Amino acid sequence: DLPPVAKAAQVVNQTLQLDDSYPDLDSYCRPGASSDYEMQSSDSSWAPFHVVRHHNIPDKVFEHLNAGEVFTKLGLFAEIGYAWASIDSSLFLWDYTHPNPELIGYEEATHTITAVALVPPKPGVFVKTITHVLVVATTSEIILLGVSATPTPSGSKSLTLYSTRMSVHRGGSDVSFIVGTKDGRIFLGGESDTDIHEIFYQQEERWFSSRCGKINHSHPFGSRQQEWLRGLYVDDTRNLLYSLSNRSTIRTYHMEGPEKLTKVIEKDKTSCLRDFAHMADSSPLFTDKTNIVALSPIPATEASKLHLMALTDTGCRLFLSATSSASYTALAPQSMQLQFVKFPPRESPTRIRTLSQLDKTSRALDPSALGFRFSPGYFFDVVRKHPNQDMLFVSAPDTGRIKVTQPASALKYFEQGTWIELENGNRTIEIGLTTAPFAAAKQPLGFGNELAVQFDQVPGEFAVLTNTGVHIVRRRRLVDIFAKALGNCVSASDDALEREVRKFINQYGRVETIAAALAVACGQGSDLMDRNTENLARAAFIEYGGQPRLASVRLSSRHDALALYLTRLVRTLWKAKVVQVDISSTIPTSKLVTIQENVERLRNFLEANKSTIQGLAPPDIANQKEHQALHALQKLMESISEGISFVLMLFDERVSDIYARLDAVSQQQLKDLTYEQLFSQTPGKELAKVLVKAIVNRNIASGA
Amino acid sequence: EQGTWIELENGNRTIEIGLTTAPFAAAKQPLGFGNELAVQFDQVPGEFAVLTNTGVHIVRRRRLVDIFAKALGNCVSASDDALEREVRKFINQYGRVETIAAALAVACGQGSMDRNTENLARAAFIEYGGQPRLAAESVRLSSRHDALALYLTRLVRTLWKAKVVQVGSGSDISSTIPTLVTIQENVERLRNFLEANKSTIQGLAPPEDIANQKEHQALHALQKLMESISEGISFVLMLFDERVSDIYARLDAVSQQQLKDLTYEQLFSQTPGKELAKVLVKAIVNRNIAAPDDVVTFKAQEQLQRASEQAHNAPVLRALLAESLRLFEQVAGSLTPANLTTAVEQMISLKYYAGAIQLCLTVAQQKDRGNTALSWVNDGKPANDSRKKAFDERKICYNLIHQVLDKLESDFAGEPELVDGRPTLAATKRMEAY
């Protein structure tokens, strides 16, 4: 009744939903606490992160820095691969990915520079080629410069600066923190007080208004005690702005309009401590003596309730929710509460490899000087136990264990952690993300599924700026760990592989492990011996893939692994529309090519092992449906490749021309045609047969 | 309450019972104070010494994760629908989200064969995590998602709202160095578990639909926060590995005061925090000199800084200068006015006039390969046009060239163009520059 490709498409749809059901942050960080860690040595194949390269500060910057009379400062523009150094009233930028960079000098400023930041531009203000705005704050004024960071053939942005005539006198309040919103709004704060200012600017000059203005959103008056800021933090997904004070007070501001900023929550350390005391597990790691050293916003795409992470100097991660009083009039929250605490790990870093209650007393992260969190939870902590050498604790969610955990009430914030040592003299200054922000889905459920996006987006990389250089740290995927582990089994027994494989099964489950073997066998992770590793991966896919059984049948883990891998290769395509109507393609052509190559390499792998892989060759009811299921998947693969080739052919011509000379029903059918329908449903095939019959007609008119 | 009877073997009388570990406290006020669940990864479980007339017995509080792990240990040999039975006990008491968060934690090596237990925990996290659904647009995420957010939050709760540093006049780090390492290791363990099970965790791999899609979006967001958390911590550890206060002393005031009230939350998830991190790394790079684009620029500054630190060895000085120029030119298009100015000035001080000029010209040509500036001047410089930017970025280079030539005639004011017949060194630099 139902043909092969339609049967396999059913498996894809159900697999997509399974990946998009990955637990949301609120679900495994429920009210309570956790100390769950599995620590890995930094030199281990199971390390969750590792250093890939380093970039020294240019010698000319050292000449200027040691030529500093009063004040110097370093910072990162990780989004574009640039770093900067300010010396008194002079500023120097450079591309740290370049082996011998030239210094972009800017010395117009008259007074000491106190802060520098790179923010998005205000729309409809600048020429489209201006990609960013450079904000330079001195003790006398704030200066805006246009920036164009266009990519180069080498892979590092070319940076050119533009004057703007946009500037405003600073005033009496120091500026040490500058943050920008998605829409180009610029907010300022510093070490004089807790006030937050905003810089406005517009293209047109008016007789009653200047091109650039500044206002204090805090409207202070009367008696005020000493208190200033330690940082500013933006969350565009909620239109919120957070400030952290030197007294560890957390203030939340809501952008109720394009020019408004309203304080809506103020939560001092006493309030946090009161919440903490009402929790089941209180700890001497968090007292009235403890300082909060950093905040990290959590976007609404990642979690609904948990808005914010706060890091103590003892290494405790405080996760705070925020809630509005009502459900309708963005809606501003009015309350903030400490709900969940992740306590520090216990293992300390060691030169030599050392050998179930809540651990709420570890000092391993004491003192924590700097801290950063990146979605879906990558955590960097600069531990400064000694005044000369920083130690870097880096952890990630145990995505594999979180995904397999059952039932939902057993979910905990499992983590994989490691210690990265920096050499003597390296003082960490800043850590920034160099790759695109992580997101496996568009809502909390499914958002944190690292496994699903292993082959759709490069692993996250992070630039660690120190006083001596920039270190690149890269997140390692399951396939990276699996390939590395197998690389150590090349010179060992049949039982050596089985032992290493069992480690993966106990953490990730059998399907995820066999899917990793399939991926490695197909060359994934090789963008980083390699024939033997891929042959070992093939051996693991065959030997440990399981078999089909009567419970309606239960297909082998080898089959589910093939379906899982294939689904993840096309997850960005399946439910997407093929075209966007001047008609264009929803998916960039370059992305369609890589997807097709991946599908074809998978097909090539199955053909070259049709004789050795169980189920491919024809074979009692169990092995029968195993053969039918595997056959249907392979028919979907070739259909996927044909479908992609058809779309590429289509846009090589002039589709808008073809679309014009077309009937309405076929324009409408093409309007809402998905890749799933093209791959697995007759109407996509019938429509494809119409389009080919139409493109050739047009091709004859061009007559090439 | 949960209770039990402990029998210490007969004939010995209890004398005293005392706390051996640090006093418990989950918060600093009554609300939140007793939340053991929130601190099971921050605090050591409470240990108690029981003194009798024969010895001291040590009694340890067992956490949720400890109970969950050992219970699973009883399900290894046992059945299939025996796990479901054991899990429901936890759900009926702790709730679905707390239960799944515990499974996640045990899957990540938290907890009191251990591999079988971890695999069992993983299995529970998968099979019992629930799914996203829409309410009565709006979606209710799965318990699996809530569990993840819950576990991650509890790992970073001590430092999230904490200031990164403490300042008395140039000094300290709020959270200790060893604790940041453990927090990092814990988070990286979590991340690893997610990747190592990208295929089988529902919502991690790409995808009624709106539900599963927003589930996928929320999980992605959580994972980007983790790597950001890892980077952030890796960055702070790097700070206090170098000479910190040396940077601070040589900073602005807005830069000094932004660092003062910088929280980990801001560093992890807000733009001003990323911007300042960039400022700080930039400072330590242009001091050891005192993305292959952002890396090269640093090495170039390091080369130029070492040149100026020399006794003047034509071989060594010329080499450093020549290489510094080589590197800067490779990243010409990306150089900022501040970095260019400082570089040129340093080259000018070392009598490298030609070199300085060559860099400025190169930078001008790279920030505008379409010659938008030439056409904007050939069109009369119409205001309101957006080539002005392209022209301004070249004018900054041309001005710096003026300074070079100015300083050249200044440095060699009174110097003869010829000595004993042939040209001097001051003359040749004038010709080489022009």
Partner: peptide, 14 residues
Amino acid sequence: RKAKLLPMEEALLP
């Protein structure tokens, strides 16, 4: 080398 600052005319439209 002082960075060449291209003019406002190019920068902002129209």
